[PDB]
Design a protein around this ligand. Structure first.
Ligand code: HEM
Ligand code: HEM
Ligand code: HEM
Ligand code: HEM
Lengths: 145, 141, 145, 141
C-alpha cells in the first residue's frame, strides 16, 4: 500500500503530465521495446520501424485511451480493483489480453516518466509509481478466469 | 548448459514416455489452462473443456516438437527454428508463459513416471524445458 | 480464492500426505533442482550430490518443520496473511530469505505431490494446490520491508 | 541476441555515462532497494542508508563490470566469466532479481540521458541488460 507521502508524491508529479503525450509515448515504446505486444494491433497500419510505431496515429490514439483511463484511476488509489473491474472483465473475456502486457506497459511508463522528469523522478518517487503500476496491473488482472 | 548427464536423463525420461507423448502434451496444456488461467488468452478460438480435440491435437504438436528437440539435443536452435519464428512473429505468446507450460509438463511427467522422476532427472528435465523455452523466445526481439 | 470444490480437494489429498516425509522430499528436491537455494543451508552438512542432499538428516529435519508449518496453515486458508505473519517477519528480519524461494518451494512441492500420488493428482487438484502454494508464498512475503 | 545495431546503440549510450558510472550504479541500487525491498535480503551486511560508502562502492563495481561488458560486447561470456562464477557459486542471488536491477539501471539511464534514450536505444539497452543477466546466471546449475 502507498503511504500518505507516496500518494502525495504520485499526485504532485502527475499534475505535470501531458496524459495524451505520455500515453502515446508509452504505448509506442511498449510496441518497440516488447514487439510481441504488437499482436493486438494488426489493424493499426505501419509498425515496421521504431519511427513508424512512434509516429503512428492509431498507436497514439490507443495510448491516449489507455493512459486516460490510467490517469482517472489515480483518483481511486484506495479502490483500484473496484475501479478497474469492468475493464478487467472486458480485457479477459473479449480482448484476450494476457495481463503480463499490463506489467510491461507499467515498466515502460516508469521509464518514460524517468526520461521525461529526469532528476525529479527520484528513487522514492519511482518506488511510489512502482506500487501504482503494480496496483493497476493487478486490478486489471483481477477478474481474469 | 545441458550436461552430458542432463542429456542422458532427458533421453531416458522421454524415451519412457514413448508413445504417450501426445497424451501427456495435452494433459500438460490442460493443467496449464486450469492452474494459470491467463494462459487461456492465447486460445480464444479453442474449446478448452476437458477432453477437447483441439487441445489434444495441439498437445500432440507440442509433444512432437519436444521429441524433435530431444533428438537434436546438441543442435536445438536449428531444429526449433521454424517454431521460434512462429512464436516470435505470429503467435507472440508473452515469454512469461513458457515457464508455466514447462512446470505443467514437469508435473505431467512426474505424475506418469514414478520410477524415473528422481531428483536428478527432475533437475535435468527442468533445465531442458527452460532451454527449449529460451530457444523458442530467442527471436522475439 | 479457492472454491469449495478446491478447498475439499486440498483437504482430501492432504489427509494422505505424510507431512514429515513429503517435507523432507520437497526441501531436498528444492536444493537439488535449484542449487543456489543451498546458500541458506551452509551449516547442514553434505550437500555435494543429489543422494547426499536427499539423505541429509538436517535437510530431512528442516523439511519436516517447514512443511509442518505449511500443513498448519491449511486449516486457515481464508487467513493465510495472518497465519504466517510471524514467520514472514522472521524470514525477512532474521533469516534474510528472498521470498522467491517460497515460490520455488511451492512448485517443487506440486511436483512431489504429482510424483507421489500419480493419477489422483488431477488437473483440477493441481489447480487448487497452485492457489494454495501461491497464497502461502504471498503470506510469507507480506511482512517483508 | 544483440544485433550489430543494438551494440552500436549500447556503446553510444553507455559511452555517455563515462565518468558517472559509479554514481549511476549506486543510484540504480538505491532505486532497486526502495522499489523492490526483497532485494535487500542479499545485502543485510551493508549499511543501505542513502549515500553509504558500501552502496557507492558496490555501485562502481557493478557499473565497471557493465563497462567491461560493453567493451567486449561480442564475447560477454568470456569477459564476465569470473563474475558469472562468483554469482553462481558463492552469491547465489535468485535469478529473478537480475530483472529488477536491470529495470532500475534502465530507469537510471533514462533519468540521466535525455538526449540519448530514444525508443530504439531503450530497446537495445533493455536487451543488453537482459543478455548481461543471462551470462551472470549461466552457470547456476
Ligand atoms: C494501464 C493499463 C491499461 C488500461 C487502463 C487500459 C484501458 C483500456 C480502455 C479504457 C479501453 C477501451 C475499452 C472499451 O472500448 O470499452 C481499452 C481497450 C483495449 N485495450 Fe486496454 N488498457 C491498458 C493496457 C492495455 C495493454 C498493455 C494492451 C495490449 C498491449 C491493451 C489492449 C487493448 C485493446 C486491444 C483494446 C481494444 C481497442 C479498440 O477496440 O480500439 N490494453 N483498454
Ligand atoms: C515447450 C514450449 C512450447 C512448445 C514446444 C510449443 C510448440 C508449438 C507447436 C509445435 C505448435 C504448432 C505449430 C504449427 O501448427 O505449425 C504451437 C502452436 C501454438 N502455441 Fe506453442 N509451444 C510452446 C509453448 C507455448 C505457450 C507457453 C503458449 C501459450 C500459453 C503457446 C501457444 C501456442 C498457440 C496459441 C499456438 C497455435 C495453436 C493453434 O491455433 O492451432 N505455446 N506451439
Ligand atoms: C512453505 C514455506 C516455508 C515455511 C512455512 C517455512 C517455515 C519455517 C519454520 C517454521 C522455521 C523454523 C523457525 C524458528 O526456528 O523459529 C523456518 C526456518 C528457516 N527457514 Fe523457512 N519455511 C518455508 C520456506 C523456506 C525456504 C524456501 C527457505 C530457503 C530456501 C527457508 C529458509 C529457512 C531457514 C534458513 C531457516 C532457519 C534454519 C536454521 O535454523 O538454520 N524457509 N522456516
Ligand atoms: C547487472 C547485473 C549485475 C552485475 C553486473 C553485478 C556485478 C557485481 C560485481 C562486479 C560484484 C563485486 C565482485 C567483486 O568484488 O569481485 C558483485 C557482487 C555482488 N552482487 Fe552482483 N551484479 C549484478 C546483479 C546482482 C543482483 C541482481 C544482486 C542481488 C539483488 C546482486 C548481489 C550482489 C552481492 C550481494 C554482491 C556482493 C556485495 C559485497 O558484499 O560487496 N548482484 N556484483
Amino acid at each position: 500500500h502507498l503511504t500518505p507521502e507516496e500518494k502525495s508524491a504520485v499526485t504532485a508529479l502527475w499534475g505535470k503530465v501531458n496524459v495524451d503525450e505520455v500515453g502515446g509515448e508509452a504505448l509506442g515504446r511498449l510496441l518497440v521495446v516488447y514487439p510481441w505486444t504488437q499482436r493486438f494491433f494488426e489493424s493499426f497500419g505501419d509498425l515496421s520501424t521504431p519511427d513508424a510505431v512512434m509516429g503512428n496515429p492509431k498507436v497514439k490514439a490507443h495510448g491516449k485511451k489507455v493512459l486516460g483511463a490510467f490517469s482517472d484511476g489515480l483518483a481511486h488509489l484506495d479502490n483500484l480493483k473496484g475501479t478497474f473491474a469492468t475493464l478487467s472483465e472486458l480485457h479477459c473475456d473479449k480482448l484476450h489480453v494476457d495481463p503480463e502486457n499490463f506489467r510491461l506497459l507499467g515498466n515502460v511508463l516508469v521509464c518514460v516518466l524517468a526520461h521525461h522528469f529526469g532528476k525529479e523522478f527520484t528513487p522514492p518517487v519511482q518506488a511510489a509509481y512502482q506500487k501504482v503500476v503494480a496496483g493497476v496491473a493487478n486490478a486489471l488482472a483481477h477478474k481474469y478466469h | 548448459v545441458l550436461s552430458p548427464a542432463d542429456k542422458t536423463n532427458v533421453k531416458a525420461a522421454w524415451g519412457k514416455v514413448g508413445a504417450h507423448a501426445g497424451e501427456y502434451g495435452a494433459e500438460a496444456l490442460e493443467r496449464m489452462f486450469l492452474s494459470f488461467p491467463t494462459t487461456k488468452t492465447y486460445f480464444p478460438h479453442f474449446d478448452l473443456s476437458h477432453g477437447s480435440a483441439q487441445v489434444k491435437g495441439h498437445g500432440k504438436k507440442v509433444a512432437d516438437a519436444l521429441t524433435n528437440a530431444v533428438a537434436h539435443v546438441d543442435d536445438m536452435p536449428n531444429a526449433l527454428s521454424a517454431l521460434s519464428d512462429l512464436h516470435a512473429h505470429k503467435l507472440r505468446v508473452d515469454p512469461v508463459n513458457f515457464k508455466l507450460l514447462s512446470h505443467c509438463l514437469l508435473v505431467t511427467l512426474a505424475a506418469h513416471l514414478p520410477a524415473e522422476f528422481t531428483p536428478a532427472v527432475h533437475a535435468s528435465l527442468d533445465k531442458f524445458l527452460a532451454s527449449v523455452s529460451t530457444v523458442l523466445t530467442s527471436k522475439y526481439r
